[PDB]
């Protein structure tokens, strides 16, 4: 259904963009952007170019959604650019909708990656028929202090640099979502890691497969009822993926949002669901309760649901290509992606 | 366009229903239902009948959305019933959607009234082409301890018993949303009133008129992207009305929801917006900031917005007929409904 982009290799040009929060250009955060760029260059051998408006600071970017859209279009129409990586999420990229040229995306298939509010930009790509990548961003992942997490590095290599099958996604040995201020004084401080416990199967007893769709569950709400919402066919036999933001949405909202997916008939079309580890593991237990209660309310207690995966608002993370075939193995408690991320 | 139902008069049979929370029939709450019914009988001269499943208790009713829908269909299909009034709101009446027969509503136009979660049931009527009424419910308004508020009595009479133009809606002199537990020992205790300071014009400077549509802004989210969402034609030249619930949605969420209304093209089609007083006037000032910020973001600073109206989760209330022509007068800071609610 979706176009798969070509793989990356050393020497390729990558564009960085600010479709949401324009913090990367602020003077006190700039060192952090530059640190992320350095890893793209040294660890992955890439060349990085910032789009013209992407570093003009949070105030300009907030007031100029059209200029943000232009940056995206510029990056897509530049044939030298082989991948596009968002600097960071935010909250208001839905304002870009009027100014997006979907054909400029459709005609220029390439890697587009990010998460959280960048979910909206992923829906741009999706609507244009392009498979994009729910994954690490410049400021939060590539710019990790002292060194990048080996796990994230591995998943970037497996998903964007190898054209082989991604295969089974093993859980990360450790995780963190500790708040460490992005001021240069902290650049040589490591974040504290916690031991990770691996995946949890909330319900389900069969092995299922289906194509990946979803994103940040708070942000997906922004697109409901708009032209940006994926057509009915995209939800058929899908594997839904959801993750929650740093705002720690209350469990009751997780319930309301999933009820709406049922009211849309989406939960009844799904082959399975996977959930990202909540930030700080806040509401870890309470979310399970609300998820299972909704499944019970709608007679969907046999639907495979996998919990505590390493995507979303904790580090490190793996990468989810929209539309790629994925598998939940309930007898084994595992999750796989049964194709390559790139051509 | 929506069908306007025939007016109410003394002797007419009115059905009560529990489309959301089923607490009305619970043993320690039943007295409160009976108190509200007594007012309907003695103040307005109506005959009140409970639908078959409406008083089976909160546990049964929670577990049986299909039974709730059948109560709704039973009331509509019975030609003896001239009006249907919700016992109370709640949170999950969206679960009724698979079970609603819309033609049963379309072929039996009559008064339907309630608020809050009952917004979803209003969307049932609205989709069936019937004008329903955002207004008082049995347990919260008609069952008010010691006596009903004169303001609420006046508006019910002006909206439901008279086929004349409703006219100008004057603000209520006092308001309340104090917690007083619905146990029978409390039945002789009045609730404390607070002073009400009238409407505030947030922005605008012209006189506009359009047809009413809206409801509880949290609950409307539940229907977005569903078959229940009103078609584009209903949003043209409208007066939007929004009110917030007892859970006090954070100001951020009001911003997100309004941004989505903008992404759908609804805010740009509206002639104006009115907002109900928040419960406990929680976030009174913060909501204003968020509302105005969203208008600024989308170049809509000339759109007349009226604030602090007496509909929503405080008592007393006036009644809003869906689809009826309303007016915001910006010089006088007033609100009026330019046609009859009934006949």
XYZ file of C-alpha atoms in Angstrom:
686
model
C 0.000 0.000 0.000
C 2.838 2.421 0.894
C 6.023 3.280 -0.977
C 9.182 2.079 0.716
C 12.148 4.496 0.447
C 15.751 3.664 -0.598
C 18.325 2.819 2.039
C 20.913 5.125 3.491
C 24.637 4.798 3.155
C 27.710 6.696 4.309
C 28.203 9.960 2.423
C 24.454 10.519 1.901
C 22.916 13.924 2.743
C 20.375 14.165 5.577
C 18.154 17.182 6.188
C 17.096 18.248 9.681
C 13.749 20.010 10.109
C 11.697 21.699 12.853
C 8.070 20.885 12.065
C 6.963 21.333 15.672
C 8.871 23.037 18.455
C 11.627 25.265 17.102
C 13.867 24.875 20.138
C 16.887 23.557 18.202
C 17.691 27.078 17.000
C 17.538 28.737 20.422
C 20.956 29.889 21.650
C 20.966 27.850 24.871
C 19.894 24.617 23.058
C 22.024 24.985 19.920
C 24.988 23.033 21.415
C 22.581 20.082 21.753
C 21.473 20.196 18.119
C 25.132 20.328 17.118
C 25.928 17.329 19.306
C 23.230 15.289 17.529
C 24.581 16.334 14.114
C 28.052 15.210 15.197
C 26.796 11.644 15.778
C 25.016 11.563 12.423
C 28.360 12.486 10.852
C 30.725 10.338 12.941
C 28.661 7.270 13.861
C 26.712 6.942 10.588
C 29.011 8.780 8.173
C 26.280 11.113 6.946
C 26.306 14.719 5.741
C 23.784 17.009 7.493
C 22.106 20.121 6.181
C 19.587 22.190 8.148
C 16.597 23.445 6.122
C 16.520 27.295 5.798
C 13.960 28.058 8.523
C 14.569 25.107 10.823
C 17.044 26.872 13.146
C 15.430 30.318 13.389
C 14.368 29.741 17.006
C 11.165 28.731 18.766
C 9.422 32.096 18.442
C 9.779 32.407 14.666
C 8.820 28.755 14.194
C 5.738 28.970 16.420
C 4.448 32.007 14.537
C 5.228 30.591 11.090
C 3.619 27.228 10.378
C 3.790 28.014 6.641
C 7.578 28.414 6.823
C 7.722 25.052 8.624
C 5.757 23.436 5.811
C 8.121 25.069 3.304
C 11.104 23.523 5.049
C 9.519 20.064 4.647
C 8.732 20.622 0.981
C 12.240 21.979 0.391
C 13.727 18.859 1.942
C 11.513 16.519 -0.107
C 12.128 18.282 -3.430
C 15.917 18.289 -2.892
C 17.135 15.206 -4.803
C 20.439 15.240 -2.884
C 18.576 14.690 0.401
C 18.231 10.959 1.118
C 16.612 11.256 4.575
C 14.750 13.774 6.720
C 15.024 13.750 10.488
C 12.904 15.891 12.794
C 14.847 17.755 15.481
C 12.196 17.252 18.156
C 8.429 17.068 18.704
C 6.165 19.726 20.200
C 2.410 20.194 20.017
C 1.157 22.338 17.119
C 2.384 20.851 13.820
C -1.285 20.237 12.905
C -1.170 23.913 11.894
C 0.989 22.900 8.902
C -1.919 21.057 7.237
C -3.144 23.855 4.908
C 0.349 24.391 3.468
C 1.453 20.858 2.676
C 1.977 19.791 -0.957
C 1.260 16.068 -0.746
C 2.341 15.491 -4.343
C 5.807 16.896 -3.560
C 6.098 14.082 -1.020
C 4.567 11.464 -3.335
C 6.984 12.259 -6.139
C 10.008 12.289 -3.835
C 10.085 9.129 -1.743
C 12.763 9.219 0.976
C 13.295 8.385 4.639
C 11.362 10.581 7.067
C 11.840 9.973 10.795
C 10.725 11.233 14.207
C 8.115 10.677 16.914
C 5.635 12.276 19.348
C 4.108 15.371 17.715
C 5.942 14.337 14.527
C 3.129 11.758 14.331
C 1.305 14.494 12.387
C 4.110 14.782 9.845
C 4.011 10.992 9.536
C 0.346 11.316 8.551
C 1.458 13.710 5.802
C 3.749 11.016 4.407
C 1.139 8.314 4.891
C -1.501 10.320 3.027
C 0.990 10.851 0.204
C 1.483 7.106 -0.079
C 4.920 7.101 1.561
C 6.043 4.766 4.355
C 7.805 6.795 7.040
C 9.556 5.894 10.280
C 8.353 6.280 13.844
C 11.699 6.598 15.590
C 14.565 8.623 17.092
C 14.936 12.401 16.664
C 18.005 14.702 16.740
C 17.699 16.350 20.202
C 16.353 13.406 22.202
C 18.207 10.430 20.713
C 21.125 11.259 18.399
C 22.237 13.929 20.881
C 22.305 11.629 23.967
C 25.083 12.780 26.329
C 28.548 11.152 26.240
C 27.459 8.506 23.722
C 24.436 7.186 21.849
C 22.729 4.110 23.267
C 24.068 1.044 21.395
C 20.489 -0.250 21.136
C 19.257 2.805 19.259
C 22.337 2.751 17.066
C 21.733 -0.898 16.215
C 18.075 -0.297 15.303
C 18.982 2.658 13.072
C 21.490 0.451 11.278
C 19.050 -2.460 10.984
C 16.166 -0.320 9.747
C 17.683 2.406 7.582
C 21.139 1.143 6.526
C 20.453 -2.530 5.917
C 17.998 -3.603 3.237
C 17.685 -7.018 4.908
C 14.627 -8.074 6.948
C 14.397 -6.334 10.331
C 13.180 -9.442 12.123
C 12.617 -9.934 15.805
C 12.750 -6.847 17.984
C 14.420 -7.790 21.268
C 13.749 -5.622 24.324
C 16.452 -3.193 25.463
C 18.537 -4.274 28.472
C 18.159 -0.823 30.079
C 15.975 2.271 29.754
C 15.730 5.870 30.919
C 13.445 8.885 30.716
C 15.263 10.993 33.339
C 14.986 14.789 32.883
C 18.462 16.293 32.326
C 18.405 19.952 31.245
C 19.762 20.617 27.755
C 22.305 23.166 28.952
C 25.920 22.737 27.804
C 27.184 22.454 31.424
C 25.510 19.008 31.462
C 27.052 17.633 28.273
C 29.446 15.302 30.128
C 26.794 13.939 32.513
C 25.277 10.514 31.726
C 21.601 9.833 32.372
C 20.746 7.169 34.956
C 19.597 3.897 33.482
C 17.116 1.402 34.900
C 17.039 -2.314 34.331
C 14.368 -3.313 31.784
C 11.922 -6.165 32.266
C 10.944 -7.091 28.717
C 7.536 -7.323 27.082
C 4.188 -8.053 28.719
C 1.337 -9.867 26.996
C -1.896 -8.341 28.375
C -4.199 -10.704 26.489
C -4.337 -12.874 23.368
C -3.435 -16.494 22.654
C -2.752 -16.606 18.919
C 0.073 -15.451 16.666
C -1.091 -12.614 14.442
C 0.374 -10.402 11.777
C -0.681 -7.153 10.151
C 0.617 -3.821 8.961
C 1.791 -1.132 11.368
C -0.139 2.091 11.915
C -0.560 4.472 14.865
C 1.782 6.754 16.781
C 1.540 9.018 19.823
C -1.999 8.385 21.065
C -2.499 12.018 22.317
C -1.330 13.429 18.980
C -3.427 11.104 16.800
C -6.462 12.740 18.416
C -5.380 15.982 16.757
C -5.974 14.470 13.314
C -9.321 12.761 13.929
C -12.121 14.054 11.704
C -9.650 15.931 9.491
C -8.586 15.208 6.022
C -5.306 13.945 7.471
C -6.951 10.896 9.053
C -5.988 7.716 7.158
C -8.719 6.113 5.025
C -10.698 3.068 6.235
C -8.596 0.633 4.190
C -5.421 1.508 6.084
C -6.912 0.212 9.324
C -7.852 -3.216 7.935
C -5.930 -6.101 9.534
C -3.550 -3.600 11.099
C -1.125 -3.816 13.956
C -1.878 -0.674 15.966
C 0.955 0.972 17.872
C 0.357 3.512 20.603
C 2.585 5.390 23.035
C 1.967 8.163 25.593
C 3.832 11.449 26.010
C 5.737 13.208 28.773
C 2.489 14.920 29.749
C 1.376 11.632 31.389
C -2.194 11.571 30.087
C -4.551 10.302 32.799
C -5.713 6.665 32.504
C -9.315 7.848 31.981
C -8.216 9.527 28.730
C -6.574 6.342 27.484
C -10.016 4.794 27.970
C -11.875 7.616 26.174
C -9.474 7.526 23.223
C -9.649 3.732 22.797
C -13.454 3.901 23.053
C -13.348 6.251 20.076
C -11.249 3.788 18.082
C -14.012 1.248 18.783
C -16.686 3.800 17.788
C -14.781 4.174 14.505
C -14.634 0.393 14.099
C -10.848 0.442 14.177
C -10.302 -1.851 17.174
C -12.592 -4.429 15.526
C -10.422 -4.376 12.339
C -7.101 -4.753 14.140
C -5.053 -7.947 14.189
C -3.214 -6.762 17.302
C -2.027 -3.813 19.406
C 1.377 -2.901 20.883
C 2.048 -0.194 23.500
C 5.230 1.740 24.209
C 6.655 2.030 27.726
C 5.011 5.088 29.326
C 7.350 7.975 30.158
C 8.873 7.350 33.626
C 6.627 4.294 33.687
C 3.983 6.615 35.014
C 0.600 4.893 35.145
C 2.247 1.663 34.077
C -0.340 -0.468 35.908
C -3.338 1.853 35.530
C -3.060 1.915 31.717
C -3.275 -1.906 31.573
C -6.524 -1.787 33.538
C -8.107 0.738 31.170
C -6.910 -1.066 28.050
C -8.323 -4.414 29.208
C -11.578 -2.826 30.351
C -12.169 -1.347 26.897
C -11.441 -4.682 25.230
C -13.960 -6.278 27.597
C -16.610 -3.624 26.865
C -16.442 -4.412 23.145
C -15.992 -8.213 23.176
C -12.353 -8.076 22.032
C -10.646 -10.024 24.806
C -8.954 -12.341 22.276
C -7.102 -9.497 20.511
C -3.321 -9.856 21.020
C -1.955 -6.884 22.981
C 1.743 -6.495 23.727
C 2.865 -4.032 26.382
C 6.101 -2.297 27.520
C 7.921 -2.036 24.166
C 10.889 0.316 23.640
C 9.315 2.893 21.330
C 7.906 6.235 22.396
C 8.987 8.660 25.090
C 11.719 6.661 26.753
C 15.221 5.832 25.572
C 16.532 3.759 23.913
C 14.128 2.898 21.098
C 13.628 0.844 17.972
C 12.035 2.023 14.744
C 8.585 1.303 13.343
C 8.080 1.698 9.581
C 4.470 2.654 8.868
C 2.668 0.001 6.846
C 5.296 -2.710 7.278
C 4.138 -6.237 8.142
C 4.642 -7.003 11.829
C 4.010 -9.999 14.064
C 2.927 -10.536 17.670
C 3.812 -14.036 18.938
C 1.738 -14.681 22.061
C 3.168 -18.120 22.980
C 6.546 -16.555 23.020
C 5.836 -12.976 23.946
C 7.767 -11.564 21.062
C 7.413 -8.909 18.429
C 8.896 -8.944 14.950
C 8.933 -6.870 11.832
C 8.705 -9.273 8.894
C 10.168 -7.075 6.176
C 12.893 -4.502 5.534
C 12.481 -0.845 6.484
C 13.988 0.345 3.185
C 14.364 -0.921 -0.418
C -32.002 21.552 8.546
C -33.606 19.860 11.563
C -37.207 18.935 12.372
C -38.772 20.923 15.208
C -40.945 18.834 17.600
C -44.447 19.682 18.878
C -44.767 21.660 22.098
C -45.407 20.237 25.556
C -48.563 20.861 27.606
C -50.167 19.715 30.867
C -51.250 16.073 30.902
C -48.619 14.939 28.396
C -46.588 11.787 29.047
C -42.813 12.212 29.505
C -40.317 9.320 29.493
C -37.178 9.198 31.606
C -34.147 7.282 30.377
C -30.654 6.420 31.555
C -28.466 6.490 28.422
C -25.265 6.995 30.467
C -24.805 6.413 34.193
C -27.499 4.103 35.575
C -27.438 5.452 39.111
C -31.069 6.642 39.103
C -32.388 3.202 40.047
C -29.757 2.509 42.738
C -31.317 2.004 46.171
C -29.655 4.975 47.883
C -30.292 7.309 44.895
C -33.862 6.308 43.953
C -35.306 8.933 46.329
C -33.584 11.625 44.235
C -35.154 10.355 41.015
C -38.561 10.327 42.667
C -37.999 13.915 43.866
C -37.181 15.079 40.313
C -40.210 13.241 38.893
C -42.444 14.912 41.530
C -41.366 18.339 40.260
C -42.174 17.361 36.658
C -45.617 16.315 37.850
C -46.390 19.244 40.165
C -44.548 22.182 38.601
C -45.302 21.459 34.917
C -48.320 19.149 35.215
C -46.748 16.254 33.304
C -47.174 12.490 33.648
C -43.812 10.740 34.085
C -42.976 7.162 33.059
C -39.649 5.319 33.436
C -38.519 3.242 30.453
C -38.215 -0.562 31.064
C -34.477 -0.753 31.794
C -33.863 2.798 32.984
C -34.033 2.005 36.729
C -32.253 -1.366 36.861
C -29.235 0.142 38.598
C -25.773 1.354 37.605
C -24.170 -2.100 37.383
C -26.743 -3.631 35.011
C -26.904 -0.485 32.906
C -23.133 -0.204 32.629
C -22.962 -3.792 31.421
C -25.852 -3.389 28.958
C -25.520 -0.538 26.437
C -27.866 -2.446 24.109
C -30.566 -2.333 26.814
C -29.988 1.416 27.122
C -30.494 1.879 23.392
C -33.687 -0.188 23.534
C -35.051 2.168 26.193
C -34.351 5.030 23.783
C -36.095 3.257 20.898
C -39.036 2.287 23.104
C -39.575 5.908 24.150
C -39.331 7.215 20.569
C -41.590 4.539 19.073
C -44.365 5.047 21.654
C -46.732 7.745 20.337
C -48.039 8.391 23.864
C -44.636 9.744 24.903
C -44.380 13.441 24.017
C -40.981 14.104 25.595
C -37.872 12.196 26.641
C -35.652 13.406 29.474
C -32.328 11.913 30.520
C -31.921 11.039 34.164
C -28.306 12.176 34.151
C -25.039 12.186 32.163
C -22.033 9.923 32.674
C -19.177 8.888 30.392
C -19.850 5.924 28.079
C -23.059 6.430 26.054
C -20.914 6.276 22.883
C -21.195 2.501 23.477
C -24.845 2.738 22.383
C -23.901 3.541 18.773
C -23.928 -0.059 17.412
C -27.485 -0.411 18.736
C -29.267 2.755 17.636
C -32.047 2.568 15.005
C -31.917 6.046 13.477
C -35.125 5.595 11.488
C -36.992 4.983 14.740
C -35.982 8.531 15.730
C -36.619 10.034 12.286
C -40.167 8.664 12.087
C -41.070 9.814 15.608
C -40.065 13.459 16.162
C -40.499 14.581 19.785
C -38.662 16.455 22.552
C -35.374 14.975 23.750
C -33.477 16.705 26.557
C -30.276 16.401 28.620
C -26.646 17.580 28.744
C -23.022 16.467 29.379
C -22.527 12.848 28.250
C -26.053 13.099 26.826
C -24.375 15.112 24.017
C -23.862 11.710 22.367
C -27.649 11.080 22.440
C -28.170 14.551 20.988
C -25.914 13.489 18.133
C -28.300 10.505 17.706
C -31.214 12.920 17.191
C -29.167 15.342 15.141
C -28.151 12.622 12.684
C -31.791 11.524 12.457
C -32.654 15.078 11.411
C -34.363 15.902 14.691
C -33.749 19.030 16.725
C -33.089 18.089 20.364
C -32.464 20.247 23.430
C -29.275 20.882 25.367
C -30.722 21.391 28.839
C -31.711 20.132 32.317
C -31.900 16.498 33.449
C -33.931 14.765 36.193
C -31.314 14.081 38.903
C -29.350 17.325 38.573
C -31.954 20.006 37.886
C -35.558 18.882 38.455
C -34.512 17.091 41.670
C -32.807 20.162 43.181
C -33.258 20.031 46.977
C -36.143 22.010 48.581
C -37.218 23.675 45.311
C -36.264 24.120 41.639
C -34.472 27.274 40.544
C -37.010 29.759 39.086
C -34.614 30.477 36.208
C -34.604 26.838 35.083
C -38.403 26.644 35.405
C -38.757 29.795 33.297
C -36.537 28.497 30.493
C -38.286 25.117 30.322
C -41.589 26.966 29.993
C -40.217 29.436 27.426
C -38.601 26.675 25.348
C -40.903 23.647 25.644
C -44.401 24.905 26.505
C -44.546 27.955 24.213
C -44.492 28.063 20.387
C -43.509 31.721 20.485
C -40.022 33.090 19.854
C -37.721 32.362 22.794
C -36.013 35.741 22.460
C -33.306 37.188 24.681
C -31.583 34.959 27.189
C -30.945 36.983 30.315
C -28.168 35.717 32.618
C -29.123 34.002 35.890
C -28.645 36.135 39.034
C -26.980 33.337 41.028
C -25.248 30.050 40.256
C -23.975 26.962 42.036
C -22.088 23.738 41.512
C -21.558 22.827 45.160
C -21.192 19.145 46.022
C -24.134 17.871 48.072
C -24.335 14.087 48.275
C -27.604 12.605 46.935
C -28.517 10.769 50.125
C -32.016 11.209 51.494
C -30.847 12.623 54.836
C -29.589 15.644 52.867
C -32.913 16.282 51.123
C -33.827 19.385 53.212
C -30.462 21.094 52.709
C -30.296 23.891 50.138
C -27.106 24.349 48.135
C -25.148 27.609 48.551
C -25.503 30.127 45.744
C -22.800 32.363 44.318
C -23.123 35.665 42.561
C -23.175 35.577 38.802
C -21.642 38.539 36.979
C -23.140 37.983 33.537
C -21.668 37.418 30.104
C -18.249 38.473 28.840
C -17.447 39.320 25.238
C -13.962 37.874 24.695
C -13.686 39.271 21.178
C -15.740 40.509 18.248
C -17.446 43.828 17.528
C -20.326 43.015 15.166
C -23.791 41.463 15.414
C -23.979 37.924 14.034
C -26.549 35.145 13.818
C -26.443 31.430 12.982
C -27.817 28.017 13.867
C -26.751 26.406 17.169
C -24.526 23.341 17.354
C -22.121 21.981 19.975
C -22.390 20.524 23.472
C -19.928 19.282 26.087
C -16.538 19.834 24.426
C -14.975 16.742 26.071
C -17.825 14.509 24.951
C -17.849 15.856 21.377
C -14.308 14.478 21.114
C -15.810 11.000 21.540
C -17.749 11.339 18.274
C -14.998 12.868 16.129
C -14.132 10.738 13.119
C -17.213 8.566 13.724
C -20.423 8.120 11.796
C -22.003 10.151 14.569
C -20.154 13.329 13.599
C -22.451 15.900 11.941
C -21.981 16.364 8.185
C -20.189 19.470 6.854
C -23.495 21.191 5.926
C -24.501 21.534 9.605
C -21.389 23.516 10.469
C -22.006 26.233 7.863
C -22.775 29.647 9.391
C -23.128 28.218 12.866
C -23.130 29.473 16.425
C -20.958 26.941 18.235
C -21.702 26.253 21.889
C -19.184 24.540 24.184
C -19.180 23.720 27.894
C -16.748 21.860 30.183
C -17.448 19.042 32.656
C -16.878 18.298 36.338
C -13.533 16.683 35.621
C -12.115 20.167 34.840
C -10.285 19.547 31.563
C -6.854 21.198 31.679
C -6.509 24.404 29.624
C -4.045 22.611 27.313
C -6.827 20.249 26.218
C -9.232 23.073 25.396
C -6.439 24.424 23.184
C -5.899 21.023 21.498
C -9.629 20.528 20.890
C -10.142 23.998 19.425
C -7.073 23.538 17.192
C -8.735 20.416 15.814
C -11.946 22.333 15.189
C -9.714 24.691 13.196
C -8.036 21.809 11.336
C -11.516 20.535 10.341
C -12.569 23.921 8.960
C -15.324 24.342 11.531
C -14.034 27.483 13.290
C -13.676 29.252 9.936
C -17.335 28.441 9.075
C -18.772 29.647 12.388
C -20.564 32.975 12.835
C -19.718 32.953 16.540
C -19.093 30.883 19.654
C -20.587 30.865 23.136
C -19.064 29.178 26.205
C -20.835 27.937 29.333
C -19.564 28.728 32.824
C -17.007 26.082 33.897
C -17.894 23.957 36.939
C -16.743 25.735 40.131
C -15.479 28.376 37.660
C -12.318 26.263 37.631
C -9.805 27.538 35.061
C -12.132 30.485 34.404
C -9.338 32.835 33.311
C -7.028 30.197 31.829
C -9.700 29.007 29.386
C -10.051 32.562 28.088
C -6.322 32.751 27.334
C -6.375 29.453 25.449
C -9.497 30.352 23.465
C -8.004 33.678 22.326
C -4.627 32.096 21.514
C -6.258 29.629 19.116
C -8.198 32.419 17.371
C -4.950 34.384 16.999
C -3.139 31.319 15.572
C -5.812 30.974 12.896
C -6.521 34.613 12.059
C -9.993 34.673 13.650
C -9.723 37.576 16.083
C -12.917 39.145 14.717
C -15.067 36.118 15.525
C -17.629 37.051 18.197
C -17.108 34.935 21.335
C -19.352 35.112 24.400
C -18.218 33.700 27.725
C -19.779 32.691 31.062
C -23.251 31.710 29.856
C -25.558 29.689 32.115
C -25.535 26.368 30.351
C -23.306 23.432 31.196
C -22.242 21.933 34.500
C -23.539 24.653 36.796
C -27.118 25.372 37.895
C -29.435 27.011 36.902
C -29.572 26.543 33.118
C -31.321 27.816 30.050
C -32.007 25.490 27.120
C -30.311 25.329 23.725
C -32.303 23.837 20.827
C -29.960 22.300 18.229
C -30.271 23.923 14.819
C -32.218 26.945 16.060
C -31.294 30.459 14.951
C -29.410 32.384 17.641
C -27.742 35.769 17.897
C -24.755 37.365 19.602
C -25.122 41.135 19.962
C -21.637 42.517 20.544
C -22.534 46.088 21.490
C -25.037 44.996 24.170
C -23.093 41.850 25.079
C -26.288 39.792 24.853
C -27.480 36.423 23.564
C -30.848 35.526 22.090
C -32.680 32.755 20.267
C -34.618 34.166 17.339
C -37.261 31.449 16.984
C -39.455 29.083 18.967
C -37.933 25.933 20.424
C -41.056 23.886 19.644
C -43.948 23.513 17.151
